[PDB]
RNA sequence: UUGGAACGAUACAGAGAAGAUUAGCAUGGCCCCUGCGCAAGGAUGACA
């Protein structure tokens, strides 16, 4: 069903973007399920860079 | 007891300013001046 494929692709794209986010083993950027990227805390300027 | 992280965390410190800084004397250069030495050289005074 097309809805099932859409859900699968949304989950797979979330997984791929999550893999890209934790590329350099940095865990202070969180990607929600609505695909909004936000820091998990008040990140320092070096970590922001 | 044994693992995450280790380009991190914390601790200390944080003037992340700006610099070869600055006073005296002697040397050295130049022009005199003064004294002495050295090598010569000028002009001049003096009777029986």
Q: How far is the CA of A17 from the C1' of B26 (A)?
A: 80
Which candidate, A49, A46, A28, places its Cα nearest to that of A37? A28
Distance, in Å, from the CA atom of A9 to the CA atom of A19, rounded to the nearest integer, reads 15
SS3 A6: helix
Q: Is the Cβ atom of A49 within 7 Å of strand B at any atom?
A: no
SS3 A42: coil
Structure tokens at A35: 């695909």
Question: What's the first-to-final CA gap in chain A, in angstroms?
Answer: 43
Structure tokens at A41: 């805390």
Q: How far is the CA of A34 from the C1' of B37 (A)?
A: 110
**What is the experimental method?**
cryo-EM
Structure tokens at A39: 């820091």
Please spell the DSSP secondary structure of A11-36, one letter per residue: HHHHHHHHHHHTSSS--SEEE-TT--
């Amino acid at each position: 069903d097309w809805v099932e494929v859409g859900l699968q692709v949304c989950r797979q794209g979330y997984n791929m973007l999550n893999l890209l986010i934790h590329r350099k083993n940095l865990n202070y950027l969180h990607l929600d399920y609505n695909f909004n990227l936000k820091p998990v805390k008040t990140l320092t300027t070096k970590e922001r860079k």
